[PDB]
Amino acid sequence: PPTSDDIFEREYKYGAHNYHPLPVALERGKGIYLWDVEGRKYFDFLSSYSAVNQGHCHPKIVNALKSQVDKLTLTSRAFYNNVLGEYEEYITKLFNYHKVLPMNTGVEAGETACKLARKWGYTVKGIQKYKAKIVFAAGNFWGRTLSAISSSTDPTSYDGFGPFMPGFDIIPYNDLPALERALQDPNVAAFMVEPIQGEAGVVVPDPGYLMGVRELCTRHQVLFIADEIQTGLARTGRWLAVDYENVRPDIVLLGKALSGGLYPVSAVLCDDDIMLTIKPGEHGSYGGNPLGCRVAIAALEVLEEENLAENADKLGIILRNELMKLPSDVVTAVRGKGLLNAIVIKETKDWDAWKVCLRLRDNGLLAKPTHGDIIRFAPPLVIKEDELRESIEIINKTILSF
Amino acid sequence: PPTSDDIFEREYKYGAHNYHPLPVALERGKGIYLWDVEGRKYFDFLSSYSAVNQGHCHPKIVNALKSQVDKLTLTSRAFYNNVLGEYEEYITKLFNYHKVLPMNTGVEAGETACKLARKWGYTVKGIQKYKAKIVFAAGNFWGRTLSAISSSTDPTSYDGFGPFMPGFDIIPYNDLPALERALQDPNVAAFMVEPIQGEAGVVVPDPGYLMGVRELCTRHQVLFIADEIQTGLARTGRWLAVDYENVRPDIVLLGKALSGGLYPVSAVLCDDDIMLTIKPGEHGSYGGNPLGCRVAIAALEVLEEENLAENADKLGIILRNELMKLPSDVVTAVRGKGLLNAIVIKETKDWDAWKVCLRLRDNGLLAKPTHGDIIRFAPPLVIKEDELRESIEIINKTILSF
Incomplete structure (x- = not known):
């Protein structure tokens, strides 16, 4: 009633x-x-x-979830489960990166990307500890944590929410000269950007912007972080939006459609040189649980088969x-x-x-x-x-x- | 094989x-x-x-999940779903708070509590904007975001992960004189603490510590945030650990067992004076999806009936x-x-x-x-x-x- x-x-x-x-x-x-x-x-x-x-x-993802919920749903990462490695191999071979780190929500994958970038800047690039900077593009949206809103230019996102995370710089979106100017600081570890800014109003950058970002990041030893949590997984017409310019980011963020709406699953994809900067016990989370892994396998298979x-x-x-x-x-x-x-x-x-x-x-x-x-x-x-x-x-x- | x-x-x-x-x-x-x-x-x-x-x-939670997955799993908060309000009324009447804010993971509920505390300190307590402080207890653990590790005294949690969130002070756990000394700063908005420190090694505070924390927080107009994500939901012998001393925190954090391990569900419980400091569009997240809400209803009912x-x-x-x-x-x-x-x-x-x-x-x-x-x-x-x-x-x- x-x-x-x-x-x-x-x-x-x-x-x-x-x-x-x-x-x-x-x-x-x-x-x-x-x-x-x-x-x-x-x-x-x-x-x-x-x-x-x-x-x-989707019946396939629903059947995956129903089949897995009768067996096992959460052991925590204190023990191994049999589904996580299968899902990891599948997704790493699908997107051609060495390794994946599983999380739950998109903002968690973004936090993970930031921690990876900082740890790589210190242990690999040689930045003196806690001087590392990350550059974002104005109009960006990657969650509602204190760091996420710290990188935001939207007042409704950050106004009234305490002092903000240092080390986050902001440049205009769709602006290669501004990125080139910002990357002159050797303390910059990464540039995180959306190939298409979804929450800003579906702001599409000019052709060649992603190629230019890749060239500028490679040139100045800066990590290219592509937030594909909304633009990835066939939403824009390719597996990733960056595929429209044949660009390989250093770190790729996936989420949202990764589960077909049946479970909070997110992923951070990158190679060993970046991923292995985080050591056992130094990061984690329901992250990598068997139920979400079965659901994500089914969702990716549905995206590929159809x-x-x-x-x-x-x-x-x-x-x-x-x-x-x-x-x-x-x-x-x-x-x-x-x-x-x-x-x-x-x-x-x-x-x-x-x-x-x-x-x-x-x-x-x-x-x-x-x-x-x-x-x-x-x-x-x-x-x-x-x-x-x-x-x-x-x-x-x-x-x-x- | x-x-x-x-x-x-x-x-x-x-x-x-x-x-x-x-x-x-x-x-x-x-x-x-x-x-x-x-x-x-x-x-x-x-x-x-x-x-x-x-x-x-648990068969009841499994049946709830199977019944809900055949109907609807995610509409996003851009629209209403029929399950969220039912779950919210149930949990708010169960824990006797005006309102609940739903999130997915425990660290997200902690981030929400921090944003609530800061917004309340500015709009209600009158702290000049971005001077608000939050006090934590040494040995605390509430996630792996940049803010969460910023409040941590564990080196493996924060070492190598960039500059840290300002406005987080740390005092010893199980120390009422230290809390009383820290709360002399009128710019303090809140004190977040675990009634039992789980990740620190199940550190149980002395009897009367929670009563003393409540008295000191009320005395100095400071919000008492109780992180019950691990100690809550019958784990320690009561609905909440604070119930062992008949203490009503200003903000209560729930998670983990909130779903019985079948879905990432977390909750931030508090009264209108605190909750309504966040206005529409100023915070959010899979948060409040119908599937997780059915699962959480079933989990709470299982905790109460058995x-x-x-x-x-x-x-x-x-x-x-x-x-x-x-x-x-x-x-x-x-x-x-x-x-x-x-x-x-x-x-x-x-x-x-x-x-x-x-x-x-x-x-x-x-x-x-x-x-x-x-x-x-x-x-x-x-x-x-x-x-x-x-x-x-x-x-x-x-x-x-x-």
């Missing part, structure tokens, strides 16, 4: 107010579709921020072609890669991105704005062309209904 | 070397027992560091009584509360805690040392008295076999 209004009003009373979600209360999910408590059906054009790239409740990167590329081309037919007085820009796209809205005194998302919900499509004018479009990579065009028709109806 | 040696040697080749586990390779777990790939049976006296308080693969705190208390009394019968030349001290205990070993040139744990494994009992002389004993709270006494016989055999 509990309605949607009963749901909202419940959380407001017993849950922290750290979110303001779109007023819709889902209770079922399958493939590209979501169902609320009233039984209404919606296209999911958010994909839990690329966490359910494989669709909601060729979801090619589908993402094709249907994203179609989606961006269709979205640019909207009026210039209505949609000022359409951007993105693969099935990770965004439109920006000319906000007026008559409408805004929040009202557009409300009306989209009213018409059977779920999306959310990220800055009151930028609306994300990222359906699960299992969507077909007819379903894509029906949801595009929904978007057209909603946007031309104003 | 893959043996234990094949398992170890696999991880060594493809996994990061951030751990040195006890050489045993488990592939099945049920209740209090674990089974390795060779089919050998072991008592689990580590309980995944209190994560499987309810035993390995009266596991009383069993923990009784069997811990029995276990500590039996352990103190060991020779003084062999075991220099036995300490702990409920089913969270530890013995300390007179390390010589003939044996050590690692060899004792190896021989325990050889005799069918799995444990791990934490400092080369301190061995933890913490079986799942579902253990019975006959099983407890058989495992005590195993411990006696192993310890007297030297």
Whole structure:
């Protein structure tokens, strides 16, 4: 019996107010579709921020989880389990890196990358201890820990949250001269960057930016950290976004879609020269538990077998072609890669991105704005062309209904 | 066909070397027992560091997970799901706090507590922005992020990991005069402490320490943060360890056993005056997903229905009584509360805690040392008295076999 209004009003009373979600209360999910408590059906054009790239409740990942939960779920890393090594070999051979370090959430993988970069700068590069610096790009988002917000240029992320982690420098995104200037400091150990800035509004850098970042990092003995937690795993049309420029980062961060939305699994991929700077007992975490490892194996196998990167590329081309037919007085820009796209809205005194998302919900499509004018479009990579065009028709109806 | 040696040697080749586990390779777990790939049976006296308080693969939690995975697993907090509010109401009424903030891992709950303390110190206490301090106790452990290791006094935790988070002060554990001296600084916003220091070697403070901490925090307008991620949820004989002194902390951190080892779920419990200092969009995370919420509901219901705190208390009394019968030349001290205990070993040139744990494994009992002389004993709270006494016989055999 509990309605949607009963749901909202419940959380407001017993849950922290750290979110303001779109007023819709889902209770079922399958493939590209979501169902609320009233039984209404919606296209999911958010994909839990690329966490359910494989669709909601993919039968293969569900079967993996059900098969593993009956056997063993957590031993802690004080002992070995039989699934972790299998998963590690699979993912290291899949992405062609020597080793992987498993964690749970994306921010944990980012913290691990920072600790790896600092430890490598001290023990390998020879930086005097605790002078090591890490460079980030403005608009970056990699979590909500104190360090993560310390690297942030978004006031809502860091304002009011105490003194901040030192050693984090910030340069403009999509700016090779600025990176070249920042890397003149020999105390810099790494540069962490998103190949596409997701949370900033799907900000796509210019062609050649990733190649330039790799060249500049190699030239000045600086580690290239690619945060592919949102852009990786077929979301942009390739296994990794950096594959669009044939670039091999020093450290690769994976997460989100790594489990298909069934378990918090994240990964830090790199070679021995970097990975083995952390010694036994010096870092760790549910990290590497057998259940999440089975789930992640199944998710990667689903990504590979169903060729979801090619589908993402094709249907994203179609989606961006269709979205640019909207009026210039209505949609000022359409951007993105693969099935990770965004439109920006000319906000007026008559409408805004929040009202557009409300009306989209009213018409059977779920999306959310990220800055009151930028609306994300990222359906699960299992969507077909007819379903894509029906949801595009929904978007057209909603946007031309104003 | 893959043996234990094949398992170890696999991880060594493809996994990061951030751990040195006890050489045993488990592939099945049920209740209090674990089974390795060779089919050998072991008592689990580590309980995944209190994560499987309810035993390995408890049928109720497994059924909750299987029922929820067929419906919905992750929508992200951009939308509402129907399970989160139910779980929030349940846990807030269970622990008698206004609100809960859900996260995934214990270190994330600690980060959330720090951000809450700082935001409350600025917006409520009136500390000038970014002068707020948080006090920790030496020997503390609450994760492996940069902030967590910044508060650590363990060199293996922080050595080589870059400059550290400012605003973290450290005082001795179990020291009320030191806390009283540290809280003279009006810029202190909070004191975070474990009611029993688990990772430090099950360090139990003197009686009255928690009451004194509460009195000193209330007196100087300082938030009392109780990290019960390991000591909570019936592990020490009560719902919370602080319940042994009828103390109500300002913020309570839960995790680990919150899911019975089936999902990374953590919680930050506090009242509105503290919780509502974080506004929508200013903090978040897989946090609050429906699958983990169903799992956590089932885990808390299992803890309450089976009266596991009383069993923990009784069997811990029995276990500590039996352990103190060991020779003084062999075991220099036995300490702990409920089913969270530890013995300390007179390390010589003939044996050590690692060899004792190896021989325990050889005799069918799995444990791990934490400092080369301190061995933890913490079986799942579902253990019975006959099983407890058989495992005590195993411990006696192993310890007297030297």
